[PDB]
Design a protein around this ligand. Sequence first.
Ligand SMILES: NC(=O)C1=CN([C@@H]2O[C@H](COP(=O)(O)OP(=O)(O)OC[C@H]3O[C@@H](n4cnc5c(N)ncnc54)[C@H](OP(=O)(O)O)[C@@H]3O)[C@@H](O)[C@H]2O)C=CC1
Ligand SMILES: COc1cc(Cc2cnc(N)nc2N)cc(OC)c1OC
Ligand SMILES: [Cl-]
Ligand SMILES: [Cl-]
Ligand SMILES: [Cl-]
Length: 276
Amino acid sequence: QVQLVESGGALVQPGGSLRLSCAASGFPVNRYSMRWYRQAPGKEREWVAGMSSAGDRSSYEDSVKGRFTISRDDARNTVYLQMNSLKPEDTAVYYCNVNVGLPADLAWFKRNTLNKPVIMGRHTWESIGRPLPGRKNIILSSQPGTDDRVTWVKSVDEAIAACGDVPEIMVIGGGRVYEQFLPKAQKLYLTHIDAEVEGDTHFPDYEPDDWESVFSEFHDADAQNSHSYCFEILERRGGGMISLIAALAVDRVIGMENAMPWNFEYWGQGTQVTVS
Ligand SMILES: NC(=O)C1=CN([C@@H]2O[C@H](COP(=O)(O)OP(=O)(O)OC[C@H]3O[C@@H](n4cnc5c(N)ncnc54)[C@H](OP(=O)(O)O)[C@@H]3O)[C@@H](O)[C@H]2O)C=CC1
Ligand SMILES: COc1cc(Cc2cnc(N)nc2N)cc(OC)c1OC
Ligand SMILES: [Cl-]
Ligand SMILES: [Cl-]
Ligand SMILES: [Cl-]
């Protein structure tokens, strides 16, 4: 039922302007984070621009910031991309992207990680597929890095060193990374999702008795959030920078086929912009 339909692509002269539209159906655009991507042949797709669900933050890749501006039309349930000072290298298929299923968890994750360094394993980096704005992104891999926009490290010790002298480091997944950082963690930020879903990755088997809950907030399933969910912050009974943040369904399920099973990603059909 969720549909994203882009229009507005055209042939434009260098230095010209264009406005793209994405007509959305099946969800209200002003209540989800929305992103634009583009892809030219022989190149990987790249994130272009995004706006947070709350509408209080927008982010752009360096080559388009200022030139491009993202906007959401409430009455038309449509997302726009205004594009100025267009260059031949802007030639690409442009399309919108949205995650649906549990937007409250993604807002909670953003609120609790902005302006902190995040550490993730290579599989989680591939699943997210874009640098998280406003955070230093640190990727664990035993192999050389493959993206200049983030910091690649080859060990737990290198990952922590790359965070520098900060008050808090957020470890954001996935299962293998959580297993190694849980014994160093002083705090767990957990979203518990009341969903029975198949998983191939689980959060590590921590002992609830060894943790004290200092924050607990219950929420109901609603029109946007498919299942009841709760936010919890635990502190280790009896100091350090490391915190884990994770969303757990029933039986500590966190992933399936390199995605979160309660999250559904949708992509538009694309519209071709040609600058010649
Ligand atoms: N909150 C949630 O519910 C979350 C769920 N997930 C889910 O987790 C799943 C992925 O988790 P998982 O499959 O365990 O993969 P991870 O995301 O933990 O990444 C694993 C990779 O990280 C690298 N790595 C791990 N430890 C080290 C180390 N000490 N030194 C160097 N490199 C290291 C290796 O990369 P290499 O092979 O290149 O060496 C390894 O293959 C996905 O389904 C994702 O959706 C992810 C994040 C949050
Ligand atoms: C920002 O979008 C994503 C974020 C995360 C990590 C994550 C998401 N939610 C919570 N509570 N903790 C986390 N560590 C994981 C993701 O997919 C695995 C994401 O893409 C949907
Ligand atoms: Cl969202
Ligand atoms: Cl990207
Ligand atoms: Cl290590």
